[PDB]
Structure formats: structure tokens, C-alpha cells
A paper describes a structure:
The androgen receptor (AR) is the cellular mediator of the actions of the hormone 5-α dihydrotestosterone (DHT). Androgen binding to AR leads to activation of genes involved in the development and maintenance of the male reproductive system and other tissues such as bone and muscle. AR is distinguished from other nuclear receptors in that after hormone binding, it preferentially responds to a specialized set of coactivators bearing aromatic-rich motifs, while responding poorly to coactivators bearing the leucine-rich “NR box” motifs favored by other nuclear receptors. Structures of AR in complex with FxxLF, LxxLL, FxxLW, WxxLF, WxxVW, FxxFF, and FxxYF motifs reveal a changing surface of the AR coactivator binding interface that permits accommodation of both AR-specific aromatic-rich motifs and canonical leucine-rich motifs.
The unbranched side chains of Lys720 and Met734 move from an extended conformation over the +5 pocket to one almost perpendicular to the surface of the protein. Only side chains move to accommodate the array of peptides, sometimes considerably, with the unbranched side chains of Lys720, Met734, and Met894 making the largest conformational changes upon binding of peptide.
Author numbering: 669 to 918
Amino acid sequence: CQPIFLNVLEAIEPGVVCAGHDNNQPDSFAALLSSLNELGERQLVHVVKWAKALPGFRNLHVDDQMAVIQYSWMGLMVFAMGWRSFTNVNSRMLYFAPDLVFNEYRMHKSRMYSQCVRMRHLSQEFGWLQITPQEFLCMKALLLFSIIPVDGLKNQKFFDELRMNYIKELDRIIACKRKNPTSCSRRFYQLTKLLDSVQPIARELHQFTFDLLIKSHMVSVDFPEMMAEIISVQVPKILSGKVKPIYFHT
Ligand SMILES: C[C@]12CCC(=O)C[C@@H]1CC[C@@H]1[C@@H]2CC[C@]2(C)[C@@H](O)CC[C@@H]12
């Protein structure tokens, strides 16, 4: 029996994305954040293509498709970056891109040191929890369906159904080599705790980027088209409490 679901997730996984950062120049706040913003713009293009190729995603109302992507991108990108950091440099640094790797000095220079430390902790958890490449893929997909508007989506029912199917696939991945129901529940607990942990980090970054966009002209930080739109139109809905994450635990 071939693993159709996982076959698809592996097949659609985005390739390497570079930031275009000039590493020959001394580090500066403006240059580092402008590069992170450009990386975000570039990654968004891949995240959209990736999401639209996910099993059942096209079932969602067209308006909900773009909405969930615009609300969940931060968590999705942070999670993927944490995994890249773990696999490429064993979490020694934050591997935003091959040409944008942050050591502690850069974390400090970026002015979001504490947030970077939390993301490095997340990266380490991939190792501590022995997250498999397959669990990573399924968990990342679940992050796309982890934050929605309190007033409901266009077709909330289709979303609920799709999210439930992805949770079901996570169950199947956990039960693969586990014949003990207790070991399965234990793993589900670990993975859902990890997934929940992504949200507070995303929230802190949402706040940071929102504040930065508002004063971007004062600090010489460039925000590309899509990033500026999403951070001024969608992110505030999250910060004002109109759009909220779906937590597993309390
Ligand atoms: C999502 C990105 C870029 C893609 C990635 O690897 C994760 C990383 C997390 C920090 C984000 C950054 C995009 C640009 C942001 C939003 C900056 O404005 C401040 C926080 C940055």
C-alpha cells in the first residue's frame, strides 16, 4: 500500500529560496530586515503554489483559500525555517536562507533577538523530539489550517472538514510504527504541543513586522508589494483579535 498522502506532500515541498542579501557588506539593521522582507515576498510565491497543490485545498471557497494563506504564512514560514535550521546547521544558527544565516550577533542586530532565540528553541525541538521528515511535512500542512476569523470563513464547514482530514493523516503517520495506543497518544500530545508553540512566536513576529512597516520610512527598511499589503490588511486583523489561532491545548 503506497502512502499517497505523504507522496504528495513530499512532491510539492518547495525547493531552496534565496534572500538576495549582500553578505559582503557589514551587517546593518536596515539591510538585514530589508532582506528578510524580500525573502518573505519570495517565499510567499512558493507558499501559495504549495498550498494550492495540497490535497483537498481546492475544495475551499476561493476567498477562503487566499485568506488562510494570508493569515497562516508567518507560522508556516517560521516552522519551515526552524526545520531548515535543524537539518542544515543542527540549529546552531537560524537558516532563513542559504544566503541569510543568522548567528547571535545578527539576531541582536535585527532587533528581534528574543524572537530569534525562541525560533532557535523551536529548531532544537525538531532534534529533541526526533521529529521525522514525514511528521514535519504533515505538521506544516496543518499549520495552514490553524488560524481563522472569529466571524467565520465563507464556507467554514469545508474548512473544518479539510482540517479534520489532515489531523486524521497525522494520526496515521503516528500509528505507522506504533502498535501501542498509549505511545500514539503520547506522540500526538508532543506534536500538538509543538504546533501550539508556533503560534505565540508568530504573534510576536506579527507585532514586530506591523510596527516596523508603520515606521519603515524612518528606519530605511524596504517592504515589497505583497508583504506591505498583507501586513497592513491581514496582519492587523490578527493583532486586533478578529482572527485567532486554533490551539489544541489551553
Ligand atoms: C517570514 C520570514 C521570512 C521567511 C523565513 O524563513 C522566516 C522569517 C521569520 C521572520 C520574518 C521573515 C519575513 C519578514 C519579516 C516579517 C520582518 O518584517 C520581521 C519578521 C520577518
